[PDB]
């Protein structure tokens, strides 16, 4: 047996490529045919190869992750569910990550302090509750989760959960990183096993290779807008074929990432050559040698079936830009200029950001710092405002001493702290007023309604890091860099070359300040407090359990019209503040949603009152007077960040089911374990016979078994009804955190309490 450590950290944690094998053999004598690598590096986790019912998009799979991440804006809610389990330590390896909590203001050292003192309560608990359960803890400064987990904690044929939507960055380095909910992070640190549902595999060959200004974001913009973002719902995506191995290591964790924008379970990549050469840059040559060693369990089977196959030439491929609301609206920076004339989108650009854990790699900031220069070099600075979040406290110090943050900063850039930002709201944004419609482009991932800044006006285009910097110089959508000039300060006309750059450092990498806290999981002792009377954290109450009757009466708290993202249910921005605090974040329940009744956010009619009103207190309008409530919705409910508040928000108010034309896997995942029924119509049209003003009865909750749909009954106000059928994904765990009230009640009467 090799003895190679999974990080750093955890020593005396070993990879278990061994175990791998033996279960992948398992389960390769049972289904007799090629596995994808996904399903290699999946049933190879599984908890039980040899009984495991194995059928793609049809059996929840149970499995074995090898470790847990969370994230602070997320931790919070995973670790009061799991101080209930009573359990003294974490079952696997498991890691706290402060980047969600750090504002943009005036830039890093200032930012990084502001946020130490306001937010000093949250990280207290964090490191506290870490300290005494055996949860290894990154310091606010420490970087994007995903950064960290991709120098630090990925590996070939890991399987590692975590809550934050964008974990399949990972896959980058070969192996399965899939986003959930806190409760399921509680779940694999309890030791109790993770469900999945068996993922069905689009394999994406890639052909050709990536040239010019081309970088590995343009994959994934090209992939999201052929797919949409429904595209890849309930499907793991592999890439293959001869273009693999043009691109880096952080070019595959780019493109694995933003996968999550297709509702992909996650993305992964073979391994090869590119990982081999990331893991040995960082103190990891060991991870790669044994990596190689069993590389036939670490790339697809020859003539595995893919359920969806897609083709990019990547040698034809162009800069895109996506946006300016979803991001799948797909434009190559070519034509990007004319569809914003069209289409009414402001072509000056205010700010461009780039960043986030999707483009915040050193070969990023390197192309970055390639575009600058050459701007520098004809005395430009840029005419958009311009923000650099850096991945790491690590690719911070790395692009500092190999110059790339003093060219990034002679354009006129300001650069953040190591932490999420801009990205989800946390912006102090000066240079509009509120309402005011602009453009902002930046090389992050998701572009929901001005999700950046909390003014629903801004129009958020995302793209390549490079083509950012190319666009910020310019100040305007209608520069393409391949083709157009711009005037030096000289009155000279230049071109800008296309970037290259080191994929990594020449010499080590730089790990500036000392981020990271070990447990001292040796005597431990030290309690963690939360304070009766905090306003940012308050203990979880217990859901109630279900009387056992049937849903009968519901009164319908909003019908939403298209497109209802997690951001809609529970947004971020100026709620980061209460994710420790349950009933002062379902204050922002649904305010983003459209009502279908008047198309507007926010504005609901109360029943009794006959009221236009607040969709938040309507809600404790009902639950105060004991009327039970339902939200109608339309496809893919609860889309995007994996937030559990957005499930734990209308449970905790009075929620009972939401019943929906489909739903984002998360989402409906949260809402199970919550105590909620995620419903959705046997047939979608039946969304148009229920009115805002129906009552609806959901029978046969007393016969809910796997598979059998429930009824229900539309009660119209004249008089008459009609019966529809309701689908449900339940099984029988999830129908028995249904009956107890949520999956933590569940566990708690398990556990004799
Ligand atoms: O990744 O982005 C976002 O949105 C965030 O990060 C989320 C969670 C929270 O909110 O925190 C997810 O999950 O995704
Ligand atoms: S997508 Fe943005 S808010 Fe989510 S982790 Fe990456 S940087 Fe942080």
Known sequence: RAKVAMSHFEPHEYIRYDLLEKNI??????????????????????????NQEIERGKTYLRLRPDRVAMQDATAQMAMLQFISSGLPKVAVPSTIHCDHLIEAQLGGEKDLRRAKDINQEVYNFLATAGAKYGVGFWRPGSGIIHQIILENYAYPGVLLIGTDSHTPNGGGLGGICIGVGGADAVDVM?????????????????????????????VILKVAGILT?????????????????????????????????????????????????????????????????????????????????????????????????????????????????????????????????????????????????????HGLKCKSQFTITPGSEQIRATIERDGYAQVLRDVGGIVLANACGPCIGQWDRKDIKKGEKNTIVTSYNRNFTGRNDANPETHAFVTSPEIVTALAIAGTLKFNPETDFLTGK?????????????????????????????????????????????????????????????????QILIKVKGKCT????????????????????SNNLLIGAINIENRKANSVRNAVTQEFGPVPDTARYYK??????????????????????????????????????????????????????????????????????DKLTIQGLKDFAPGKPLKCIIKHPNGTQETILLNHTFNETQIEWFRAGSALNRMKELQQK
């Open 25 to 50: 053999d398992i389960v390769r004598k049972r289904l007799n045919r090629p596995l994808t690598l996904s399903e290699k590096i999946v049933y190879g986790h599984l908890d039980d190869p040899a």
């Open 190 to 218: 309890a030791g109790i096993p993770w469900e999945l549902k068996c993922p069905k595999v689009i394999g994406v060959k890639l052909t050709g290779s990536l040239s010019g200004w081309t970088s590995p974001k343009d």
């Open 566 to 585: 997690t951001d809609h249910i529970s947004a971020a921005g100026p709620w980061l503040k209460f994710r420790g605090h349950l009933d002062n974040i």
């Open 229 to 377: 973002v429904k595209g890849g719902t309930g499907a793991i995506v592999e890439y293959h074929g001869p273009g693999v191995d043009s691109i880096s290591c952080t070019g595959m964790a780019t493109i694995c990432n933003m996968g999550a924008e297709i509702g992909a379970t996650t993305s992964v990549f073979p391994y090869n050559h590119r990982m081999k050469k990331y893991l040995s840059k960082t103190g990891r040559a060991d991870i790669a040698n044994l990596a190689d060693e069993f590389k036939d369990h670490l790339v697809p089977d020859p003539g595995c079936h893919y359920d969806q196959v897609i083709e990019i030439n990547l040698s034809e491929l162009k800069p895109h830009i996506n946006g300016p609301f979803t991001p799948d609206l797909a434009h190559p920076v070519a034509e990007v200029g004319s569809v914003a004339e069209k289409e009414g989108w402001p072509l000056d650009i205010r700010v461009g950001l780039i960043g986030s854990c999707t483009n915040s790699s050193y070969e990023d900031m390197g192309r970055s710092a390639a575009v600058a220069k050459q701007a520098l070099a």
């Open 490 to 554: 000289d009155g000279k006309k230049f071109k800008l070359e296309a970037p290259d750059a080191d994929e990594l450092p020449r010499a080590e990498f730089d790990p500036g300040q000392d981020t990271y806290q070990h447990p001292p999981k040796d005597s431990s002792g030290q309690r963690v407090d939360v304070s009766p009377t905090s306003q940012r954290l308050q203990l979880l109450e217990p859901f109630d359990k279900w009387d056992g009757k049937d849903l009968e009466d519901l």
């Open 624 to 693: 105060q007077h004991g009327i039970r409530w339902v939200v109608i919705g339309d496809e893919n409910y609860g889309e995007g960040a994996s937030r559990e508040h957005s499930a734990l928000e209308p449970r905790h108010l009075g929620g009972r089911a939401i019943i929906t034309k489909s739903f984002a896997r998360i989402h409906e995942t949260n809402l199970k374990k919550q105590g909620l029924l995620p419903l959705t119509f046997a047939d979608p049209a039946d969304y148009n016979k229920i009115h805002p003003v």
